[PDB]
């Protein structure tokens, strides 16, 4: 009658098992202790439920793998809060060595506390595992509601009714790090042969505990399911030199790499759920239905007529309508707020589909999966998009793509095997990611001057797509630099507001560049700008680049490989520009 094993098992038995596992040296011994507990629980369950069942090992497992808790929200509990509380309850001298050590704990804490507890708290535990869960539930729920005093009272119950040793373990469950000395994967494997695979397509300990309650009954065709959080497929880092072999000497896809929030979308008619990469529920943000949220109302009607159910994998971007650009994560500005203040909007960049109307697609080829994707919805630029991809088979094509990508201020490229299927939580297989070899030194901080510009297209024709940048020729002692040598073209995409602000600040200073009557202050190579700007009116940008290579396109006789503007350095005057001599020393060092 809604009976549970957890209501019968002292939290003390769970803790004595954790203590034995942690103190065991060998893996074998660690596993044995876990097995003995798990096995007793299973036999008890069978006896308890003979004449009845959704009950399972979940109440224990959620405490054994606290980092996998998904039902309960954050506790909001700091080591420093526990410290004060213990100092009260144990009546420690407020200025003594024990009190200070607790208060001055440097980020383990459970062990420091336990040593203070062992000789002064002799109480025997009284809580069942179920009652421990109830109090943790209370802590989390009260934290959500910022009811500080109720959090304390729940903590107070946990502490006054638990043994010193149990308190050691409570602290670790609260912090979410047990330090058992045995891995999460081992825990899963010991529990059920299928537990890990199931967990990968349902990020839910309860589901795994309940569905795999019987260790001798497997699950067939474990797969991605509507409204269950699967772990995203991951990309392995790839050295661009080996890319043709890595793609099984056959044709492959090159796809744009977006740095947003990895997000999967689940749809059934008017009902929507969204899961982040860790399997937390973001439906409150994006929208459970077409009349609420920051995204769903705007994309519900993009879906094609025949599509009732679908599951998508992709990336959430912050899109600027006025510039038609995605804003990068790293900015001095507030992306979340501007999204809320309607300055920016949420855009779902989609690169995969795992289900359409009850066809499951995990095992289809990425090739087939992409085909299907174009049938799911009609893209709306700036709300819901299909990530751009192309076919390629050559290393040089990949060099081209990376070159283009960095130019547009993207930070890398993706490469994908068309034959490949979708493997949740696996890194490698069909998905590779490629980024520039950035070596962190002076090469990360090239401080150079903007000397010229190139216009964007159509309506973005008022904004610049690229800047031309130069270094200073070292001037006679006393005077400011008067001659600059071009060094590199670099992308000007408004992926951060400071670049937008910079463009508007410089707008009034551009002058038409004439090949036949060029300004004396700017010396060029092959590459000429559309417009230039007098040095004293300009701004220094800090540039990250992977390599300095020879070039006849720039006056310096060389240029920057994969250059990206990192910062606008308006804390510098134009004449503080890096010189030819600096460039020269940098190159050969």
């Amino acid at each position: 009658t809604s009976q549970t094993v957890a209501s019968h098992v002292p939290f003390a038995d769970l803790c004595s098992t954790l203590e034995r596992i942690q103190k065991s040296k060998g893996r074998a011994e660690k596993i044995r202790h876990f097995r003995e507990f798990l096995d007793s629980w299973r036999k008890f369950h069978d006896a308890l439920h003979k004449n009845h069942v959704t009950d399972s090992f979940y109440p224990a497992m959620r405490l054994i793998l606290p980092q996998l808790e998904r039902e309960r929200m954050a506790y909001g509990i700091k080591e420093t809060m526990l410290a004060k509380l213990y100092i009260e309850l144990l009546n420690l001298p407020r200025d003594g060595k024990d009190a200070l050590k607790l208060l001055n704990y440097r980020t383990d804490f459970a062990m420091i506390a336990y040593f203070v507890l062992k000789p002064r708290c002799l109480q025997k535990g009284s809580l069942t595992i179920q009652q421990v869960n109830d109090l943790l539930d209370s802590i989390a729920s009260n934290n959500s509601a910022k009811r500080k005093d109720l959090i304390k009272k729940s903590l107070l119950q946990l502490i006054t009714q638990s043994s010193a040793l149990e308190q050691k373990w409570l602290i670790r469950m609260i912090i979410k790090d047990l330090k058992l000395g045995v891995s999460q994967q081992t825990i899963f494997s010991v529990f059920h042969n299928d537990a890990a695979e199931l967990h990968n397509v349902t990020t839910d300990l309860e589901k795994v505990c309940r569905q795999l309650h019987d260790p001798s009954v497997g699950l067939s065709d474990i797969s991605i399911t509507l409204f269950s959080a699967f772990k995203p497929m991951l990309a392995a880092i790839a050295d661009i030199e080996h890319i043709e072999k890595d793609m099984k000497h056959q044709s492959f896809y090159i796809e744009t790499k977006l740095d947003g929030e990895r997000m999967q979308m689940h749809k059934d008619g008017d009902v929507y759920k969204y899961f982040s990469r860790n399997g937390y529920n973001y439906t409150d943000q994006f929208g459970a239905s077409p009349t609420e949220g920051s995204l769903t109302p705007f994309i519900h009607n993009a879906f094609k007529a025949d599509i009732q159910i679908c599951i998508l994998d992709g990336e959430m971007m912050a899109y600027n309508p006025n510039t038609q650009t995605f804003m990068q994560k790293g900015t001095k500005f507030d992306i979340k707020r501007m999204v809320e203040d309607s300055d920016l909007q949420t855009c779902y960049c989609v690169f995969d589909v795992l289900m359409v109307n009850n066809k499951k697609l995990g095992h289809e080829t990425l090739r087939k999966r992409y085909e299907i994707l174009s049938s799911i919805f009609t893209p709306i630029p700036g709300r819901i998009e299909i990530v751009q991809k192309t076919q390629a088979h050559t290393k040089n094509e990949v060099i081209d793509a990376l070159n283009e990508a960095i130019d547009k201020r993207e930070e890398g490229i993706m490469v994908k095997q068309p034959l490949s299927i979708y493997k949740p939580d696996k890194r490698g297989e069909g998905w590779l990611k490629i980024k520039p070899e950035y070596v962190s030194g002076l090469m990360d901080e090239l401080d150079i001057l903007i000397v010229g510009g190139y216009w964007g297209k159509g309506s973005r024709g008022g904004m610049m797509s690229h800047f031309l940048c130069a270094v200073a020729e070292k001037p006679p002692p006393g005077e400011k630099p008067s001659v600059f040598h071009t060094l590199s073209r670099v992308g000007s995409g408004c992926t951060m507001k400071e670049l937008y602000d910079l463009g508007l600040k410089l707008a009034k200073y551009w002058k038409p560049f004439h090949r036949k009557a060029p300004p004396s202050s700017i010396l060029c190579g092959t590459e000429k700008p559309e417009v230039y700007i007098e040095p004293c009116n300009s701004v220094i940008v800090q540039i990250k680049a992977a390599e300095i290579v020879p070039s006849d396109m720039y006056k310096t006789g060389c240029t920057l490989r994969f250059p990206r503007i990192e910062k606008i350095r308006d804390d510098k005057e134009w004449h503080e520009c890096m010189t030819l001599d600096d460039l020269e020393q940098l190159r050969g060092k």
């Binding site: 098992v9 002292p10 038995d13 629980w41 006896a47």
Partner: peptide
């Protein structure tokens, strides 16, 4: 009704 202590300390 089975008692847990028989199952655990076994």
């Amino acid at each position: 009704v089975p008692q847990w202590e028989v199952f655990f300390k076994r």
